[PDB]
């Protein structure tokens, strides 16, 4: 039989429809919406199906409804019309009822509890209500299907209206007129009938493989290529192909977690803790910790994207593969790629026409699959020139335009790029300029936001610092919180640069400008990194402290202070006479200011701000008893 009882279920829902609340949170849910639905000129309701698990009896209905979803929905349609009629004229709150009474309605639950996944379903689970999620790839054009058949008698012109029931066409045998009764006289007119839209949308399903979905009526063309989708429909396989008759589609934590987030947000060692906790296997590298982390935070997206990209110009023995391999896991799911093992087709796509669909179809490459996420490109120095040409438009407009035989179209591949590149030769050569140690053209090398020069020096002292860190780690914040933090930060914070932070950028950029390769590309990093720092701070505006720290980070990443302004070479070491004179001149002025004020002494905090606009110099004076 049927688990659904016609009168029992409509009574059970009637109690739910008038008594449901979540636990001002105390207000009833649909006591408010019922009036709003009568106001609406819509033809259906997307029912808040998460309410079913939020109430006791509704979950019991769900298990009962698991095998009979159609019957209740059909009953709800009449119930909706009856609810409209009762609220309009029986409650005497409205009088516009004519169109509603004659027409037909539907209801769509959208947040039902998910099932045990696609591949885990069973032959008896066919025709049962399910809930799935996935990504839409392709869409078929509008396909009409028969609903009403129009027959005209070919000898007397009499017309009949015949409607299909359960997919059956019934040909009348004789004309229904009293006089004209010629057998088989009824004829079908193709273009006097009535049709309904049927569309097939292709979904890449990730169970709680790709499944070809199906939609009907107003649900067609509501789903388009690249849409992020959750499915509430019926798993189907009929005499046998696996497909889902989509009933509804969705186009898309505790307060204790908020307390946990705020504790890390409030503590002063926030940046220190993040570096200390992001990569246990990698020792120190404070700036590199700040670098990739700011890539994951990302800037703000306005219409101007925040896709920060980083080049690791380190020596070819520093753990950087140990990072990006680890980055691919910790980050929200992206794609791990190698420049050596990738091609222009491999990154972008292969696009071709389809006979059935009569419009372009795409086979997404590595780069496109990372749309909206993060991708890692190892062996960036070994990428083919044709493939490298793609990145120019990717890192300037996040789009790729193709114009070849029979195909002219543009795509979108908005993504973040993490790039690691060994120096030319077996090791970095500081005796040559930095731009000559990197095997990348200036047009491509300029558009990266951050370039990091990680060098390894043979120092016995620093060797023990690194060695004892690793050697004891393999004897004998968690990733769950870290991902929870990043997802929280990306979700909420959209900082806006303040007036004070804006003006400092001018002096910061001009200073690098007059030292010239300081193109306007690096000015993008002067805002992109600024927003990502405030987002980590969770401050809803970008602070000047974020601005100056990011500028310092760019300076430290490129090592400007250790780079020759003449030929671009790097100092190996990065007591001097200039240190002497500065200390001497500082000491001379301190001896005056300490006594020029109308006191024998003053606080050192005020003294520093008086002259800096020091501790060693005054300590030496104390040693000399001055």
């Amino acid at each position: 039989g049927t688990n659904v009882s016609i009168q029992e279920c409509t009574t059970n829902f009637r109690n739910f429809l008038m008594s449901f609340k979540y636990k001002t949170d105390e207000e009833l849910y649909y006591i408010k919406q019922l009036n709003e639905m009568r106001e609406l000129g819509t033809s259906n309701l997307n029912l808040d199906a998460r309410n079913l698990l939020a109430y006791k009896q509704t979950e019991d209905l769900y298990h009962q409804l698991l095998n009979y979803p159609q019957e209740v929905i059909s009953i709800m349609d009449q119930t909706i019309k009856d609810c409209m009629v009762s609220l309009i004229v029986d409650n005497n709150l409205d009088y516009d009822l004519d169109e509603i009474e004659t027409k037909f309605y539907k209801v769509r639950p959208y947040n039902v509890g998910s099932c045990k996944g696609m591949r885990e379903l069973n032959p008896n689970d066919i025709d049962k209500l399910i809930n799935l999620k996935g990504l839409v790839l392709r869409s078929t054009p509008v396909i009409p299907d028969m609903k009403v058949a129009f027959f005209k008698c070919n000898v007397c012109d009499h017309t009949m209206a015949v409607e299909i029931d359960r997919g059956v066409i019934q040909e009348p045998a004789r004309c229904e007129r009293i006089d004209c009764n010629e057998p088989n006289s009824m004829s079908l007119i193709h273009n006097r009938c009535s049709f309904a839209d049927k569309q097939v949308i292709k979904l890449q399903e990730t169970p709680d493989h790709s499944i070809s979905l199906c939609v009907y009526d107003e649900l067609v063309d509501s789903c388009r290529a690249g849409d992020r989708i959750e499915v509430t429909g019926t798993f189907r396989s009929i005499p046998y192909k696996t497909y889902v008759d989509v009933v509804h589609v969705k186009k898309v934590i505790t307060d204790q977690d908020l307390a946990k987030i705020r504790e890390v947000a409030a503590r002063e060692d926030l940046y220190s803790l993040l570096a200390r906790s992001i990569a246990p296997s990698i020792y120190e590298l404070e700036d590199v910790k700040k670098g990739i982390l700011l890539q994951l935070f990302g800037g703000t997206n306005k219409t101007y994207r925040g896709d920060i990209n980083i080049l690791l110009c380190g020596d070819p023995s520093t753990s950087k593969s140990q990072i990006l391999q680890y980055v691919h896991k910790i980050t929200p799911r992206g794609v791990y790629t190698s420049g050596k093992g990738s091609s222009a087709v491999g990154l972008t796509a292969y696009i071709t026409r389809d006979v059935d669909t009569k419009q372009l179809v795409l086979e997404s490459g590595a780069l496109v699959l990372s749309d909206g996420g993060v991708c890692c490109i190892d062996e960036f120095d070994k990428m083919s020139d044709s493939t490298r040409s793609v990145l120019h438009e990717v890192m300037e407009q996040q789009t790729i335009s193709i114009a070849k035989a029979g195909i002219i179209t543009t795509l979108n591949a908005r993504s973040s790029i993490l790039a690691s590149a060994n120096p030319i030769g077996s090791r970095y050569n500081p005796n040559l300029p930095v731009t000559e140690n990197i095997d990348l053209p200036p047009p491509l090398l300029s558009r990266f936001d951050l370039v990091y020069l990680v060098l390894d020096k043979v120092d016995e002292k620093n060797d023990r610092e690194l060695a004892k860190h690793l050697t004891n780690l393999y004897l004998e914040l968690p990733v769950e919180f870290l991902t929870m933090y990043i997802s929280y930060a990306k979700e909420h914070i959209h900082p806006i640069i303040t007036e004070a932070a804006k003006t400092e950028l001018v002096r910061a950029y001009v200073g690098m400008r007059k030292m010239g390769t300081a193109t306007t590309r690096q000015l993008e990093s002067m805002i992109r990194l600024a927003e990502a720092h405030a987002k980590m701070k969770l401050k809803n505006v970008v602070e000047l402290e974020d601005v100056q720290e990011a500028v310092r980070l760019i300076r430290s990443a490129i090592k400007d202070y250790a780079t020759d302004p003449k030929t671009g070479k790097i100092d190996m070491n990065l007591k001097s006479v200039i240190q002497r004179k500065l200390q001497e001149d500082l000491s001379r002025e301190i001896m005056n200011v300490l006594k020029d004020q109308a006191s024998d002494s003053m606080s050192f905090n005020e003294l520093i701000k008086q002259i800096n606009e020091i501790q060693e110099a005054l300590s030496r004076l104390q040693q000399e008893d001055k």
């Binding site: 040409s389 335009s401 805002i527």
Partner: protein
């Protein structure tokens, strides 16, 4: 009359040519020469037919070369987003057949049929190509006939027609050394040979320097993009009228 007066206010004003140049891609700062050049390209000259039978080109080809920091792709994006008919494409992505003409086997028969390439699309319009110096010479050649004769000649597998290709090519490219080798002259920094250079009625090379007075203003307003005379709809209305005059 209201349409007539609205269109008239853009013609019978004493400074309209000055005004309209400042109304091309207002987001891009500076480069006031290219704003004149493209605006003139958008109003291509009079096509003429000789009493002898020869025809004279009326459309204008323009090339722009700059350092990888000088915003030039923004001009192409603006043109393809503004022009009545326009096509955007990239250097390496494009190919000879895709640009000019595609010989494809036709349905309902065993004989071939042309398919409109990039140039045939947006005919009587502006065609835009980015990273022109990246294009192959062998598929740069195919544009030559369309640039001057405004026609495409095909003799391949049973097809022998000549197709209208009245298109104004707009291109962007970078010098051979990535940066402009300011030690040398304009003669040596460009890999474009003499034939293609002669065809471009206008040819711009824009350079960048470390002038503080310029960079401070340049940095001031590019930040305003990330901070946030005649309207863009007015220009198409004006052009739909201007294209008629034949001086």
């Amino acid at each position: 009359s209201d349409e007539i007066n609205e269109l008239k206010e853009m013609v019978k004003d004493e400074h309209i040519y000055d005004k309209l140049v400042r109304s091309i891609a207002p987001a891009v700062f500076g480069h006031e020469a290219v704003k004149k050049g493209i605006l003139l390209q958008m109003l291509g000259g009079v096509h003429k037919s000789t009493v002898e039978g020869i025809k004279l080109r009326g459309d204008i080809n323009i090339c722009v070369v700059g350092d990888p920091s000088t915003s030039k792709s923004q001009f192409l994006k603006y043109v393809v987003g503004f022009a009545p008919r326009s096509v955007y494409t990239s250097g390496k992505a494009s190919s000879a057949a895709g640009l000019t003409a595609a010989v494809v086997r036709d349905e309902e028969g065993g004989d071939y049929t042309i398919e409109a390439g990039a140039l045939m699309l947006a005919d009587n319009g502006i065609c835009c190509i980015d990273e022109f110096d990246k294009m192959d010479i062998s598929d740069q050649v195919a544009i030559h006939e369309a640039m001057e004769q405004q026609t495409i000649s095909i003799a391949k597998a049973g097809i022998h027609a000549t197709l209208n290709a009245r298109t104004s090519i707009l291109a962007a490219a970078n010098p051979v050394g990535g940066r402009y080798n300011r030690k040398l002259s304009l003669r040596g920094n460009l890999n474009m040979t003499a034939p293609i250079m002669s065809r471009f009625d206008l040819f711009f090379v824009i350079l960048d320097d470390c002038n503080e007075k310029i960079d401070t203003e340049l940095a001031s307003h590019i930040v305003d993009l990330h901070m946030k005379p005649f309207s863009a709809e007015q220009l198409r209305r004006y052009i739909k009228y201007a294209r008629t005059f034949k001086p």
